[PDB]
From a paper:
Phycobilisomes (PBS) are antenna megacomplexes that transfer energy to photosystems II and I in thylakoids. Here we show the cryo-EM structure at a global resolution of 2.9 Å of the 5.9-MDa PBS from Anthocerotibacter panamensis (hereafter A. panamensis), a recently discovered Gloeobacterial species that diverged from Gloeobacter spp. around 1.4 billion years ago. The A. panamensis PBS features a configuration comprising two herein characterized linkers and presents a paddle-shaped morphology. The two-fold symmetric PBS contains twelve APC hexamers assembled as a heptacylindrical core surrounded by twelve PC hexamers, with approximate dimensions of 273 Å (width), 500 Å (height), and 129 Å (thickness).
The top and bottom AP cylinders also use different linkers to connect to PC hexamers. For the bottom pentacylindrical portion of the core, two common CpcG linkers tether the Rb and Rb’ PC hexamers to the A/A’ cylinders, whereas, at the top, an unusual combination of CpcJ and CpcN is used. Two CpcJ linkers connect four side PC hexamers (Rs1/Rs2 and Rs1’/Rs2’) to the D/D’ cylinders via the inter-domain linker. Although previous studies proposed CpcJ as a linker in Gv742128–30, our study is the first to demonstrate its function structurally. The bilins at Rt1’I (CpcN) and Rs2’I (CpcJ) have longer bilin distances to the core (36.0 Å and 35.9 Å). In contrast, bilins at Rs1’I (CpcJ) and Rb’I (CpcG) have shorter distances to the core (27.6 Å and 25.1 Å). The CpcG-mediated PC hexamers Rb’I show the shortest bilin distance to the core, suggesting the highest energy transfer efficiency. The differential bilin distances from PC hexamers to the core generated by the three linkers could be a selection target to eliminate the less-efficient CpcN and CpcJ linkers during the evolution to crown Cyanobacteria.
Numbering used by the authors:
A (entry chain X), F (entry chain W), G (entry chain U), J (entry chain Y), K (entry chain T): 1 to 172
B (entry chain 3): 291 to 338
C (entry chain Z): 17 to 76
D (entry chain O), H (entry chain N), I (entry chain S): 2 to 163
E (entry chain 3): 436 to 531
């Protein structure tokens, strides 16, 4: 697994050199911003069931074919698997947000997920759509100012969005 | 045809059948053939 | 905690092995296994299903 | 789905043996009592309309606190897919009757029931009330072995919901 | 997958090790070994093939240091149940 | 693993509808001849060793190439493997006869068998020949009128023939 | 662990003789009562959650010290273990009632159940009282004649009471 | 021994769940079929001596060589053991009929049959031919479903010995 | 196959270590015993036809009841297969002698022996008699140690059959 | 796995034939010259650390790129794995020298090894170079006539050379 | 797991001193007469089924109660277990004979056998009688002066008798 620090160390090792002063400065900035990062990750974690439920409601209102007999979220079992997968993906996105690196998301969650869904008959376009709805709900919660000290956290927003849309791109 | 005739009639049927049964097969397969193909001779002959 | 279960086999295990056949090498009957609390119930059910006889359980 | 036939074939396969006499006897029992089960299935399919409407009305009577605004039963769409859910339960109960095994119920409704009901905040007691009503008029619609066979599956679904 | 998701990694390992299969074949004292190179009762005729696919030889490993990563091998075969060419094998074994 | 009842349920559920009246009639008919179907399955189970032995005798008479030094069934181990395979395939045929559908046969026995034989270097033509000889030795015992009530079971004979032929066409 | 028929076979083989005519008559009587017995065990398995819930309500009404902090039914973890143990005991009671033998109960759990409860320090008298409450609820649900044809079953209630008593007496 | 009711209970305890509809299914089938099975057990019991003597003579018939001096069947002790063994097989058949499951058969003759017979140089074909004798005899001695019940257990014994 | 050298290498490899003093001393013993074993194999190869004919004749003398019409020992095909089987056994005995291990026997004959003999109803006693014959004439054919190795291997085959 | 004797037996079984007088003479000659083979195997075993250290020093002198940052033996883990590989290859070559057949190499040592290195990214030219260096280091110990009865053993040198070559050829 | 040499080395190491010349002479004698040891072990092995069959016939002629129903060797599987136990004892006795040390028999076969039999209900005295009967049959087979050059091997006879008697004593 990799976080931002460990990737930096990895390229430095590939060159065989120490870490330059600019790289150390970037890592210092990261660690300074780490408390905002923790707030973002806790917003994702704390409000997770709400995010999953909102995404599910929007997705199954948009795509009613998924919940008709013959749909891919029709019986209770397939619906449970659908909600489980959405929870899993959001959970690995929160991991990547804390780590500052999308490595765990790729290695664990999106390692072979497109071929999995293709073999299952699962519409990967709809899975990507669910990831987008989860992203929207997550941004609604992460921009919330209640119970945090106000500040600029746009870099965290953009990075969270990149994790979400990277998941959606790997799936579809 | 004379050779075929001699083999059929001249000698007893018993040793004829015995030698026919021991003729080398056209499948030239050792006992470990098949495990050498899938590469699992070692994985099978390891001691438990 | 951790519990020590002393196991015996007085024939139910024997007849099960007789039906199925010796399938891992044979071993002596009376033996003791240490089990944590989390694995305590499944190990107990497994022993009961196998025909095993538990003579005593000790807590430590 | 796991039925009598599927169960006996599975237990024969796992042990790597031909189907023995006990499994053949069980299969014969299933084949003989198919007829009451299919009669029950025909009865429930024919009466499905009044069955589902009565069940939804029973749910509303028992939980009048659900139809007010701000709650789950409020709305026309929520009504319609209440009826849709009860029709699902009825259809899978008839599937269970026909198949002479609860496999359709397990596979289609029971497998994943709790987490779905928790995710969408569906009280299992709503559905237990609906199925208890259906249980009530199964006696009105069914008789003999047919009634007990249908009751078995209705109780199985209620137990799983419990 | 559901087991790991709902009960964690340790319960997932315990399922393998507390399984009836493990205890039947290895049972508390023998090291595990590769069984699937012989027919096992209840096998699905693709289990032999899936093991041959998973097995890489005596000098093969399961390392995560391979160039592409540590990647799945049996997903399509498992979900499909096979190659998906069998109906056409049946068609071929008729006229042509 | 599907029988006729579960297959009918699966189709009915893809449609999203209850079992139709004609579907119930067909399933009631199936349950009606269930007793004759059980007679056929018992005929196959009670006479398995004779079926296998007859098939083996004819098979090794026809293809003596198989049992000479070098043949694929030559040493005691590989001959025993041959007989074991014959018993397995016959067992799965009997399962398919009981269930009324070949789903169990194809899924659990045939889907990868041919490529298993190819991997091991086993002649698939000879295995198909063995399965055909098993079909022959099984029809004779299957029609045996003794010990059971006289009646008509031609549909059952055709169904069993289809199972054996599907096995032979899959393996070959 | 053996059934009533297998028990009778057991004594018959211990003396080495064929089954006597009186013993055969007893087994035939049991097989005649069998349908009543299946109605009884179906009653037990069918109403199990209600039986457990009622027994628990009464047991923790008559014994609050289990509910208080420092009690043995406290916290959620221990309370769930209590409910699960009643579940298992009722399951084994139904198993014994269907089998008609009492040793299928003693060789399944009761052999080590007491030693377990002494190791954990659980008050065995409370578990016995719980089983007795379960017995009362089981007789209440057993005697219900709705949706089943009417008849005497006194032997079945007597046998169920004996099995509940055996559990409650082997634990305590 | 593992019989129909016993297999029900073992399957239910293996999965840690109750007796469901299919298990009640099998139990009802066994309980209703007990009557032909037990009448067959009675008939086999009453005719035990005739059957065992007929089977002993059948073995001495299809294997004339076993009886000459220096062979295994020669001697009064050996033929007494023959009679006792055929009686054992018949008794376990009747036990399996009563239990309505091959559990008695499996556990009392089948398990350990092959290596014991290897150790004592007992040919399984002797007992196969004897049991075929009992099969033919009971095909006449029994009427209706009881004939099927006896013959299925006899053929299971044949499949085991073969 | 399982020989001295192969067992040595398998044990060294299973523990992931080189060949030490113990293993080399075992291989040394193998290389010394090669001489008696190889020339015992030479003597057995030379007299193969007489040995096989005598073993078949001994089988028939001990089992006269096979050769009359209707059973296994009747027919030119059956007797030819008998000669083929005894030649197989002798061939693999010589192979085992040369390889200084029961690997050839264990791998080609003994593995699957009982299942195959059961399936085709071949009595192991026939082959036991044939091998006891082979033992009798290898007693006089061979002297000193060669007799000893050939007897060890013949008796391993016999033990496997019994 | 096979030795020379089992290889001969396997080839004779494909012919359904006993071993010829000439082939038995070859096997007897192999056995009589077995003490020399044992001494060669002892030379490989006893001097294994010297052989591997010599090969490693020469290999990393010739190819400095293997031990730079980014090389295939840079961190301690990759160098340790390299030394393990060399030890394993020498161990199996000694196994083959004792057996008399390269079968042990093909069945175990070189079974999936080229694909292993290819998937890892190991430069197989360098592995074959290490194997050749080991061959050079091992010939000097094989040829050492100190402390052993002097005689003609050129055949063993050639055989060991060919086993090292077979390893190197399978790699590269 | 020891032999004579390892046991002697163990005592030498407990005293902390080199092996004495008397000990060296004793072990050189043991290795010189080890040829007779190999003959005795081969005689034990080649005739193992004969020994077991003879001992079983003798034991079941004498102890007739085991065979009868209710006896420990009545159920046909229990006869199989009896035969298996006899073979195991013979195998371990031959192991100990080859080693020259009885520790391999004890530590691996006999340490728990008493408790096993007592938990089972097997009569240990009959097992001891079976062991003695095996001792008699084995003595008959070892003393067979045919097949080997005649020689004095009273030490081997005594050693085998000690192993059989010690196995019997540990069992009963
Ligand atoms: C136990 C887990 C844990 C958490 C949750 C945690 C959060 C945390 N947030 C902090 C402040 C802060 N938190 C935020 C982030 C918020 N501000 C904006 O509203 C954004 C919407 C949002 C980002 C998603 C900001 C901007 C600060 C001010 C400090 C700074 O900007 O460096 C601080 C510093 C002290 C303070 O000002 O309260 C901490 C320790 N620390 C922990 O150990
Ligand atoms: C280390 C080697 C080893 C040995 C030797 C051993 C002995 C042993 N004997 C057993 C049963 C048995 N052993 C015997 C044999 C005795 N009873 C008869 O009376 C004979 C006179 C006598 C034989 C000489 C019998 C009859 C049983 C079956 C007991 C039963 O099922 O009730 C069992 C239980 C079988 C099981 O649990 O599946 C063991 C473990 N166990 C081992 O791990
Ligand atoms: C396999 C068979 C199956 C069942 C049984 C099933 C139940 C089910 N009902 C649903 C909708 C729903 N169904 C109900 C139920 C009714 N609403 C009220 O009128 C009543 C009080 C109440 C019933 C008594 C409700 C409240 C929802 C809302 C879920 C949402 O808003 O997303 C949903 C969510 C999918 C959707 O948005 O339509 C499921 C999974 N689904 C299935 O595929
Ligand atoms: C559940 C369905 C299923 C089947 C049927 C099945 C068959 C099967 N046959 C096998 C080997 C074999 N199978 C055969 C049989 C063939 N060769 C003979 O010549 C005949 C022509 C023919 C039989 C009529 C032979 C000879 C082998 C040994 C191949 C070898 O290892 O060299 C193997 C490899 C493992 C082993 O040796 O036991 C499998 C898995 N596997 C399955 O999972
Ligand atoms: C122990 C498990 C069990 C078995 C095995 C079983 C078979 C069975 N099939 C029966 C009827 C029958 N059985 C057959 C089948 C035969 N007829 C043809 O000659 C074929 C050769 C052959 C089948 C291929 C037929 C045609 C009937 C009559 C159909 C009917 O009852 O209307 C009957 C007698 C019922 C009666 O005729 O009144 C039995 C006992 N029943 C069981 O409870
Ligand atoms: C395999 C056979 C079997 C046995 C032997 C069994 C008894 C049993 N009870 C247990 C715990 C328990 N059992 C109870 C029972 C409750 N305490 C009282 O208040 C109630 C009256 C009573 C209800 C019956 C409690 C409270 C615990 C939790 C003990 C603790 O953690 O402190 C455990 C340990 C659970 C674990 O560690 O995972 C077992 C094995 N259940 C079985 O299926
Ligand atoms: C498939 C599962 C199954 C069910 C649903 C079942 C109910 C059932 N009860 C029956 C009769 C009966 N059942 C009972 C038992 C009842 N008497 C009292 O009301 C008690 C509350 C209760 C038992 C505790 C009695 C007394 C009879 C009538 C006596 C008899 O027919 O033997 C019958 C026989 C009628 C027939 O088929 O011809 C059935 C099938 N049996 C089953 O195997
Ligand atoms: C409860 C189940 C059970 C069975 C089935 C069983 C078979 C059996 N029969 C035996 C004796 C025997 N049984 C026979 C039977 C032969 N006599 C000839 O007339 C016929 C050709 C043939 C019978 C068809 C013979 C010859 C023996 C003597 C074996 C010996 O040489 O010691 C023995 C040896 C132990 C003894 O009786 O002292 C066994 C194990 N034992 C069991 O405990
Ligand atoms: C190299 C390993 C190997 C061995 C040892 C071997 C023996 C062997 N011999 C066979 C045939 C046979 N072998 C015999 C032997 C009998 N002939 C009679 O004269 C005697 C009483 C007796 C010999 C002492 C007989 C009768 C058959 C024909 C059985 C049948 O087809 O029904 C068969 C059955 C398959 C076939 O017909 O070819 C085998 C497996 N096969 C092997 O692959
Ligand atoms: C404990 C392990 C063990 C070892 C190591 C062993 C080796 C061994 N080497 C021997 C002599 C010998 N050793 C060699 C080999 C040497 N000749 C050249 O100098 C080469 C450098 C080198 C081999 C590559 C030769 C040629 C002989 C003389 C035997 C002959 O030429 O036939 C001998 C026989 C002594 C004699 O000459 O009478 C043995 C037993 N034996 C063992 O049991
Ligand atoms: C492959 C397995 C193997 C065996 C079996 C083996 C036995 C063996 N027995 C031998 C002679 C002998 N064998 C015995 C055995 C005794 N004679 C008495 O009759 C006793 C009944 C019997 C005790 C069991 C004796 C005393 C000698 C002669 C010892 C001597 O040469 O001084 C010899 C030396 C013959 C010579 O080279 O001159 C060997 C190597 N060696 C082996 O490598």
């Amino acid at each position: 697994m990799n976080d931002v620090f460990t990737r930096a160390i990895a390229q430095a090792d590939l060159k065989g050199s120490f870490l330059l002063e600019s790289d150390l400065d970037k890592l210092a900035s990261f660690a300074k911003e780490g408390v905002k990062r923790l707030d973002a990750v806790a917003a994702l974690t704390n409000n997770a069931p709400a995010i999953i439920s909102d995404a599910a409601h929007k997705l199954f209102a948009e795509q009613q074919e998924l919940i008709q007999p013959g749909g891919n979220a029709y019986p209770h079992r397939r619906m449970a698997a659908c909600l489980r997968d959405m929870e899993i993906i959001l959970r690995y996105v929160s991991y990547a947000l804390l780590a500052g690196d999308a490595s765990v998301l790729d290695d664990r969650c999106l390692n072979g997920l497109r071929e999995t869904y293709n073999a299952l008959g699962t519409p990967t376009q709809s899975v990507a759509r669910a990831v987008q709805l989860m992203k929207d709900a997550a941004m609604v919660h992460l921009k919330s100012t209640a119970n945090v000290t106000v500040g600029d956290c746009s870099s965290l927003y953009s990075e969270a969005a990149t994790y979400f849309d990277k998941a959606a791109a790997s799936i579809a | 045809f004379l050779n075929m005739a001699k083999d059929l009639t001249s000698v007893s049927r018993a040793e004829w059948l015995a030698k026919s049964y021991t003729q080398p097969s056209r499948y030239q397969q050792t006992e470990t053939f098949g495990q050498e193909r899938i590469g699992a001779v070692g994985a099978i002959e390891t001691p438990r | 905690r951790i519990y020590k279960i002393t196991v015996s086999e007085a024939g139910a295990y024997a007849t099960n092995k007789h039906r199925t056949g010796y399938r891992a090498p044979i071993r002596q009957s009376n033996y003791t296994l240490t089990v944590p609390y989390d694995r305590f119930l499944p190990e107990m059910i497994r022993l009961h299903q196998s025909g095993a006889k538990i003579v005593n359980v000790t807590s430590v | 789905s796991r039925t009598v036939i599927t169960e006996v074939i599975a237990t024969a396969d796992s042990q790597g043996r031909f189907l023995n006499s006990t499994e053949l006897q069980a299969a014969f029992g299933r084949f003989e009592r198919a007829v009451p089960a299919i009669e029950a299935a025909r009865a429930l399919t024919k009466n499905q309309d009044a069955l589902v409407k009565g069940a939804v009305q029973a749910v509303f009577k028992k939980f009048p606190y659900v139809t007010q605004p701000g709650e789950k039963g409020y709305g026309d769409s929520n009504q319609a897919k209440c009826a849709r859910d009860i029709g699902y339960y009825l259809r899978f109960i008839t599937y269970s009757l026909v198949a002479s095994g609860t496999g359709p119920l397990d596979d289609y409704v029971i497998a994943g029931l709790r987490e779905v009901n928790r995710a969408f905040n569906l009280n299992p007691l709503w559905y237990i009330e609906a199925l208890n009503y259906i249980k009530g008029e199964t006696g009105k619609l069914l008789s003999g072995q047919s009634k007990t066979e249908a009751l078995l599956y209705i109780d199985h679904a209620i137990n799983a919901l419990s | 997958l559901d087991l790991w998701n709902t009960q964690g990694y340790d319960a997932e390992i315990d399922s393998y090790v507390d399984s009836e299969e493990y205890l039947d074949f290895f049972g508390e004292d023998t090291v595990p070994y590769f069984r699937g190179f012989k027919y096992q009762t209840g096998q699905s005729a693709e289990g032999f093939n899936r093991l041959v696919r998973l097995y890489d030889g005596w000098a093969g490993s399961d390392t995560d240091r391979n160039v592409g990563g540590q990647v799945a091998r049996l997903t399509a075969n498992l979900t499909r149940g096979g190659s998906g060419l069998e109906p056409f094998i049946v068609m071929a074994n008729s006229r042509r």
